[PDB]
Amino acid sequence: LSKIIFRLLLNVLMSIIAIISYQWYEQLGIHLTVAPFSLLGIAIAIFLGFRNSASYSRFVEARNLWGTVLIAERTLVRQLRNILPAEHDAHRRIVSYLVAFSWSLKHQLRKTDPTADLRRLLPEERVTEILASSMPTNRILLLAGNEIGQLREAGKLSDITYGLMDNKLDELAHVLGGCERLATTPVPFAYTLILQRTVYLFCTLLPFALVGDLHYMTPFVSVFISYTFLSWDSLAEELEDPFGTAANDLPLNAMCNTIERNLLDMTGQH
Amino acid sequence: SKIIFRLLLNVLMSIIAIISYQWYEQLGIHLTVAPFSLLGIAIAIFLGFRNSASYSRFVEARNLWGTVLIAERTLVRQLRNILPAEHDAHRRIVSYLVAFSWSLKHQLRKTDPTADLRRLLPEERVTEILASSMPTNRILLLAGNEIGQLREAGKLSDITYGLMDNKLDELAHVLGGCERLATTPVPFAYTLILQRTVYLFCTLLPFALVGDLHYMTPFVSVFISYTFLSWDSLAEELEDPFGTAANDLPLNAMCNTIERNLLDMTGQHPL
Amino acid sequence: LSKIIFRLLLNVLMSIIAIISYQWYEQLGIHLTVAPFSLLGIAIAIFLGFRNSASYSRFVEARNLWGTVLIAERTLVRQLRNILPAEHDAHRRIVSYLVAFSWSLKHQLRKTDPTADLRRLLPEERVTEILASSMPTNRILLLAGNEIGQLREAGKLSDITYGLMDNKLDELAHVLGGCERLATTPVPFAYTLILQRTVYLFCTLLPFALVGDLHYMTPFVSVFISYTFLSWDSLAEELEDPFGTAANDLPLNAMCNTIERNLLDMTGQ
Amino acid sequence: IIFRLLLNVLMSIIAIISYQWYEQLGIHLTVAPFSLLGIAIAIFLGFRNSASYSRFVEARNLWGTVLIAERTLVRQLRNILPAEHDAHRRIVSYLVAFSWSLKHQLRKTDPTADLRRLLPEERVTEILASSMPTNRILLLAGNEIGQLREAGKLSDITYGLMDNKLDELAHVLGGCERLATTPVPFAYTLILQRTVYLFCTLLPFALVGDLHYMTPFVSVFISYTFLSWDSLAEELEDPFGTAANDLPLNAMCNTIERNLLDMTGQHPLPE
Amino acid sequence: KIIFRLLLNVLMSIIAIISYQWYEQLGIHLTVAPFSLLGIAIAIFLGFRNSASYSRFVEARNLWGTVLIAERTLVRQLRNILPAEHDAHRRIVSYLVAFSWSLKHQLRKTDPTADLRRLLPEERVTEILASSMPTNRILLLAGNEIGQLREAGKLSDITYGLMDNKLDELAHVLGGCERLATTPVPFAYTLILQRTVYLFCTLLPFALVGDLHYMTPFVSVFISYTFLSWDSLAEELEDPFGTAANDLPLNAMCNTIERNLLDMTGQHP
Ligand SMILES: [Cl-]
Ligand SMILES: [Cl-]
Ligand SMILES: [Cl-]
Ligand SMILES: [Cl-]
Ligand SMILES: [Cl-]
Ligand SMILES: [Cl-]
Ligand SMILES: [Cl-]
Ligand SMILES: [Cl-]
Ligand SMILES: [Cl-]
Ligand SMILES: [Cl-]
Ligand SMILES: [Cl-]
Ligand SMILES: [Cl-]
Ligand code: NA
Ligand SMILES: [Zn+2]
Ligand SMILES: [Zn+2]
Ligand SMILES: [Zn+2]
Ligand SMILES: [Zn+2]
Ligand SMILES: [Zn+2]
Ligand SMILES: [Zn+2]
Ligand SMILES: [Zn+2]
Ligand SMILES: [Zn+2]
Ligand SMILES: [Zn+2]
Ligand SMILES: [Zn+2]
Ligand SMILES: [Zn+2]
Ligand SMILES: [Zn+2]
Ligand SMILES: [Zn+2]
Ligand SMILES: [Zn+2]
Ligand SMILES: [Zn+2]
Ligand SMILES: [Zn+2]
Ligand SMILES: [Zn+2]
């Protein structure tokens, strides 16, 4: 939302009403000096800084989580190749679950229908199993767990090597919880609330308290200052929705294609 | 808002200063802005650090709770994956894990666990659990006996027992982390004196503002007091993430989620 | 007498000295404005802010270190119960080592005498061994490990299950190193050196600069600015020795109590 | 940078010889407003430079891990299979291939020469076919370890100890990829840069009122401070970007090669 | 050094007083307000920077903490798992102690030969000295000891593994210290911040003088002290393996390490 070019423009308009209405000032007895707006301005900058910090960390964590999908699924596929080179059937099954897991997680975070993707990757019976669950993505881990478990029952994996691969499903479990946590735990609203008020009220009142000092250069300076606060406030906005579909949000489709392309590269009998 | 009170209180004090500004020279009282710029910026800097510290507590607490869901999900998965047919154990262990969550929430909210416990476990167990001064720990220990017995009975190997044992440790770390964020507050000086300071600063501020703003002073002073006081109380809220304030953690919702997860479809699983 | 008040009262005095002496300023050739004191005050506030941040983090780390003791001991005893439910002989021995470890750790950090706490807990053949070492706490860990080792040699623990319990001793190992590191490595004394000087001198010289602008108001404002600064500075100092005996420091006594009661509860004592 | 210092001096000299015309027209520039702007920018640069620094440090840590993992893997190979020098040499090849290949991948440069020197041409073709060559190298390292296991020279346990090390390299590969196909601040980084750029150009105009002829000196000093801090952030933000200092990455890949040749007695020269 | 810049600063204040007369005449005005802006900017930057420096120092301290922990726990595992193998005990301890001293040498860029000779047979010294990285070669030798115990069937794969993990931890320590030592952030950008604070401090009185007159040097020195104190403390912490006041007592830390390992293996300093 580029209300930035709206507020920038609404700012010019506030400068102009300030310039012309500057007379009726002492009649009334209303004075605005810079100094107390420097105090508030500074306080707001500090609080914006700390807040944007949190915003940024949340977005970084969203990237890291998704990064771990790629890492853990890569490594699970590696272990399967290196430990069971012969077993391409199991290879293909486990891969399709891992790929399904990624897509499913994207769908869940975007609240979209994973049915088509699941159906492209899995047999109908497995899809039914997945979609029947109140927690589909988590049920994909269970099914992948079951493949690993069969290999174990059949003696193709020992307890040790079964365990090496289980750890990978643990990591994917940490991704899934993390994303869920992030999705339902925003940076607290109070922050963005408080700050949105103060930053808007501030950019509004500002040309009024600059007009005393600047006369005609009010608009050009009040705009430059306001853009600075709003640019910085809006970087938070652009970082607060990691899973969304906006241009600034995570390109989750491409990340899913990357994951799928990677797992497919590591298979094919080679 | 206890804030709306003190915001209005700041408007009264701000009128007082508009009426007093002539009588300044009579009484002998000059008051420039610049010392209040100095003081205000210091307080802002300290409010920044304090707030950041509070948020960290919030975020750790949120995370420790996230681990409950993860760890419990992976323990159930492992039991389903390794002992697919052992539904009686599945059911027993899941109820301990669910008891674990609720018990932890009660522990931290200082409320009575009994209703939630009885809902989930047989009564002998509820008394074994309520008998301990550490009920959450006792639930963990009981959950441990379940996997221990599967091992004694040769149903788990040492390896596979260990994979599950790891998950109980993960929950032990949550229990410990949560107890540390609960019993251990951030010292009472931090809040006690910082609140004094922010308020004292806010009331005096217009006295120093008049000379410059004259009439506009009640406005531009309430705006400043909002900013400082908003920030201070939010910090105070977030410091106690298991409290029942608006910006604290939805502990009830989070246990509902955990429960719905483990018990999803009468606990039925494929293969 | 309480130091902070003394420094406040020494500041109300510094202020009067400044009101009375403002007359002589013109004469003696001393002009003092607020603006440079702003620059300095802010600078000091910034550095005070980051400094306090470090002190808090040190306090938090100590807290976490102690939290690990309770976690790792609980899970060790839990494992002992879950893996060897019959072997209460070993349970009791190991639990007493774990309880000794905490008290030993506590006393070590307080630079006090473990003898009573250890005598309350262990046999004399062991207490003297432990006190014979310049590293008692590490020695208790070595002994807890013997227990776990014996159970392994006796075939009661497999290599694997031994392994599971070994990790928990490692975790206690890290707590010991951490606490020792915090006890012996201070927040560089330079932090308290530069900041105590600077903050005191600043609060002192400040009324001399406020008087120009504030006159008889000087005391009120200057004491305020001083309380803010000194309050923040002293908070850093209290947070910095987390292992101290102040009421503002960690209640190590209560924590070791919680630990002991906890492991006893788990063994049915 | 030096271009923007010279432009700042030019803008200063303009500010001086035009101070007359403009301030008479009713267009004024005080210092207090630009002091508010500049402090806020400074605050933002501070927070920004912190995010930057920490991406730089994360890059150091990831590359640190390569050094650590690769050393410990080769150590394990020697301690567990002292006799299997052919395997030692193959595995060391892939490990060193991995480093160089990662470096090439991050710096968008050609890995071919490094691969051709280290590996058989079959392997190089396979690696070069893949859209993920670095990952492929790890996969090849994996087969080496996997074969020693299949041949019964490694047990599942000791296989596992080495498998850990490969996972560590997987974490590095991905972390680095994430640090490259960055950033996270989606080119706001150009906004703040222009904000600083503009602030520094308007600055002499806001200053000349108070400084007159001293303007260019005090304006350039301030500009230098702001522009430097901004430049530092830009450097730090982008550890793998096209203008990055390649000395340390090259030093690291050289160190690991040297260390591993040392560990497998390929150094020193025989007598 | 700090006292040099302070004296040079008292001098420059006088230059500003004596030459304030010519100010009007030469056509040079210098207000406080612009210097406040620069000043606060720089303070913010020093605040952030100093905090990065402290972070590095705390990490360095921590890494050394792990040497002690990992080494203690390795010896512990050796005693608990192989109580009879006291030859191995002694040889591995020799390597672990060699490791610490060699690490100090590496970080101080000094010769490890004396310390190595005190601890190990000459054949082993030659092997260790021949390597581009003596500390890495020491871990490999420690690794053969446990490896040989594994070959001989005296350790299982599992118990070898528990011990392997500790060597893995030492490798991590080595790496982290290597990273912190060779981690001059572009050598340019610490020299640039130094000239910055320096230049600012020398120009400050010229700007302060209009307001302060004779008081210039007092305020100007107080301010310069504050900023320089901050800046130089950062520089110390930035290089924790150096030989400055507030840099790690690495020789003391190595002594503690050696003493601990000797204590654990029944030997007497
Ligand atoms: Cl395949
Ligand atoms: Cl394949
Ligand atoms: Cl897990
Ligand atoms: Cl634990
Ligand atoms: Cl017992
Ligand atoms: Cl018992
Ligand atoms: Cl490693
Ligand atoms: Cl070789
Ligand atoms: Cl992995
Ligand atoms: Cl070799
Ligand atoms: Cl350890
Ligand atoms: Cl010994
Ligand atoms: Na261990
Ligand atoms: Zn992993
Ligand atoms: Zn295949
Ligand atoms: Zn979005
Ligand atoms: Zn986990
Ligand atoms: Zn079941
Ligand atoms: Zn008025
Ligand atoms: Zn643990
Ligand atoms: Zn017992
Ligand atoms: Zn008995
Ligand atoms: Zn005594
Ligand atoms: Zn490692
Ligand atoms: Zn070899
Ligand atoms: Zn002039
Ligand atoms: Zn070499
Ligand atoms: Zn003039
Ligand atoms: Zn360790
Ligand atoms: Zn021995």
DSSP-derived secondary structure for chain C: --SHHHHHHHHHHHHHHHHHTTHHHHHHTB---SHHHHHHHHHHHHHHHHHHHHHHHHHHHHHHHHHHHHHHHHHHHHHHHHH-TT-HHHHHHHHHHHHHHHHHHHHHHHT---HHHHHTTS-HHHHHHHHHSS-HHHHHHHHHHHHHHHHHHTTSS-HHHHHHHHHHHHHHHHHHHHHHHHHHS-S-HHHHHHHHHHHHHHHHHSHHHHHHHHBTTHHHHHHHHHHHHHHHHHHHHHTT-TTSSSTTS--HHHHHHHHHHHHHHHHT-
- Let me know if A200 is exposed, middle or buried by CB neighbors in 10 A (0-12, 13-18, 19+): middle
Rg (CA), chain E: 27
User: What amino acid is encoded at A232 in this protein?
Assistant: W
Measured between CA atoms, the residue of chain D closest to residue A168 is: D167
Say yes or no for a CB contact (<8 Å) between D38 and E42.
no
Q: H-type helices in D81-132, by residue range?
A: 85-106, 112-118, 121-129
Of B55, B31, B39, B18, nearest to B237 (Cα)?
B55
Of the bound ligands, which one is closest to the alpha carbon of residue A270? 2
Q: Quick one: which H or E segment has residue B225? A: helix B217-238
Q: Which residues contact D166 (CB under 8 A, 6 or more apart)?
A: A75, A78, D73, D138, D141, D142, D145
Note whether B248 and B241 are within 8 A (CB).
yes
E229 CB neighbours in chain C (<8 A) are 190, 194, 198
D199 CB neighbours in chain A (<8 A) are 224
Query: Which single residue is written with the structure tokens 């063994």?
Result: C267
Q: Which residues of B are annotated as a binding site?
A: 25, 30, 80, 87-88, 90, 112, 169-170, 173, 214, 240, 248, 264, 269
Measured between CA atoms, the residue of chain A closest to residue D196 is: A228
Roughly what angle, to the nearest 10 degrees, separates helices C189-205 and C35-83?
150
Say yes or no for a CB contact (<8 Å) between A41 and D46.
no
Query: How many other CB atoms are there within 10 angstroms of residue E3's CB atom?
Result: 9
Q: Which of residues 87-126 of C touch B (CB under 8 A)?
A: none
Q: Which residues contact B251 (CB under 8 A, 6 or more apart)?
A: B65, B105, B108, B109, B242
Note whether B228 and B44 are within 8 A (CB).
yes
Q: Which of residues 188-207 of B touch C (CB under 8 A)?
A: 189-190, 193, 197, 200-201, 204
Of E48, E183, E192, the CB nearest to D228: E192
Beta bridge partners of A30: B214
Please give the Cα distance from D229 to E98 (Å, whole number): 43
Of the bound ligands, which one is closest to the alpha carbon of residue E24? 28
Say whether residue D19 is in contact with chain E using an 8 A CB cutoff.
no
Please give the Cα distance from D122 to D125 (Å, whole number): 5
Beta bridge partners of B29: C215
E63 Cα: distance to centroid of ligand 11 (angstroms): 12
Please give the Cα distance from D65 to D165 (Å, whole number): 10
Q: What angle do CA E210, E211, E216 make, to 5 degrees?
A: 85
Say whether residue E32 is in contact with chain C using an 8 A CB cutoff.
yes
E247 annotated ligand-binding residue: yes
Please give the Cα distance from C228 to B260 (Å, whole number): 50
Say whether residue C132 is in contact with chain E using an 8 A CB cutoff.
no
Rg (CA), chain B: 27
Tell me which of D178, D193, D230 to substitute to probe the interface with A (most A C-beta atoms closer than 10 Å): D178
Q: Which chains touch B (3 or more CB pairs under 8 A)?
A: A, C
C267 Cα: distance to centroid of ligand 21 (angstroms): 5
Cα dihedral D106, D108, D111, D113 sign? negative
C92 Cα: distance to centroid of ligand 5 (angstroms): 5
- Find how far residue D166's CA is from the centre of its chain: 22
Per the entry, the structure determination technique was X-ray
B270 CB neighbours in chain A (<8 A) are 129, 142-143, 146
Report the gap between the CA of B264 and the closest CA in chain A (Å): 6
E36 CB neighbours in chain C (<8 A) are 35-36, 38-39
C235 CB neighbours in chain B (<8 A) are 187, 189-190, 193
- Find how far residue A190's CA is from the centre of its chain: 19
Q: Which residues contact D141 (CB under 8 A, 6 or more apart)?
A: D91, D94, D95, D98, D166, D169
Alpha carbon distances (Å) from D151 to B179, C128, D81, D155 = 51, 53, 12, 10
Of the bound ligands, which one is closest to the alpha carbon of residue B24? 19
Tell me which of C15, C19, C75 to substitute to probe the interface with B (most B C-beta atoms closer than 10 Å): C75
* Tokens, residue B133: 């001064």
Give the CA-trace dihedral at A85, A87, A88, A91, to 10 degrees.
Answer: -90
E72 annotated ligand-binding residue: no
How many residue contacts between D and E have a Cβ separation below 8 Å? 151
Q: What angle do CA A65, A71, A76 make, to 5 degrees?
A: 125
**Residue A32 DSSP code:** -
B155 Cα: distance to centroid of ligand 2 (angstroms): 33
Say whether residue B187 is in contact with chain C using an 8 A CB cutoff.
yes
Please give the Cα distance from B231 to B247 (Å, whole number): 13
* Tokens, residue C238: 């209290």
On the CB side of C66, how many CA atoms lie within 13 Å of its CA? Answer: 30
